[PDB]
Swiss-Prot record, chain A:
Keyword Mitochondrion: yes
Organism: Sus scrofa
Phosphoserine sites (modified residues): 70
Principal subcellular localization: mitochondrion
Family: Belongs to the eukaryotic ATPase subunit F6 family.
Residue(s) carrying N6-succinyllysine: 46, 61
Quaternary structure annotation from Swiss-Prot or TrEMBL: Component of the ATP synthase complex composed at least of ATP5F1A/subunit alpha, ATP5F1B/subunit beta, ATP5MC1/subunit c (homooctomer), MT-ATP6/subunit a, MT-ATP8/subunit 8, ATP5ME/subunit e, ATP5MF/subunit f, ATP5MG/subunit g, ATP5MK/subunit k, ATP5MJ/subunit j, ATP5F1C/subunit gamma, ATP5F1D/subunit delta, ATP5F1E/subunit epsilon, ATP5PF/subunit F6, ATP5PB/subunit b, ATP5PD/subunit d, ATP5PO/subunit OSCP.
Lineage top rank: taxon: Eukaryota
Keyword Phosphoprotein among record annotations: yes
Cellular compartments annotated: Mitochondrion; Mitochondrion inner membrane
InterPro entries hit by this protein: ATP_synth_f6_mt (IPR008387), ATP_synth_f6_sf_mt (IPR036204)
Protein name per the record: ATP synthase peripheral stalk subunit F6, mitochondrial
Record's function text: Subunit F6, of the mitochondrial membrane ATP synthase complex (F(1)F(0) ATP synthase or Complex V) that produces ATP from ADP in the presence of a proton gradient across the membrane which is generated by electron transport complexes of the respiratory chain. ATP synthase complex consist of a soluble F(1) head domain - the catalytic core - and a membrane F(1) domain - the membrane proton channel. These two domains are linked by a central stalk rotating inside the F(1) region and a stationary peripheral stalk.
GO molecular function, one term: proton transmembrane transporter activity
Length: 70, 52
């Protein structure tokens, strides 16, 4: 069916004329890609784009031992 | 003999507690060293992991 071989490539080239993502999204693709974009961040964490690690650690304080001896 | 050897073996017990103190604080300071590096090593992947 090479007449069908040409007819699924030629209506693939029409999909390669794109402006803003989906062609017939409407309220469908706008809600779904925003529902999924939250879920990759919801149970994952709150993370910005480029912020480095900012913290500070304190070690164990070295106490002394009192000892009258001999 | 015992009262001489009571002070003899005591000062070998006094120096044991200073070998143990000198390596414990040297190591407990060192355990926080790479753990400071680990969390920055952790965080530089997580901002990469969120984008990919």
């Amino acid at each position: 069916v090479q007449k069908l071989f040409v007819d699924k490539i030629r209506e693939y080239r029409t999909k390669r004329q794109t402006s803003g993502g989906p062609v017939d999204a409407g309220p469908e693709y706008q809600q779904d890609l925003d529902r999924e974009l939250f879920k990759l961040k919801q149970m994952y964490g709150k993370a910005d784009m480029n912020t480095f690690p900012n913290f500070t650690f304190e070690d164990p304080k070295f106490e002394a031992v009192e000892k009258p001896q001999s | 003999i015992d009262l001489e050897k009571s002070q003899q073996a005591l000062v070998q017990k006094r120096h044991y507690l200073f070998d143990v103190q000198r390596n414990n604080i040297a190591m407990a300071l060192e355990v926080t060293y790479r753990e400071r590096l680990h969390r920055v090593y952790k965080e530089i992947k997580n901002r990469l992991d969120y984008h990919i």
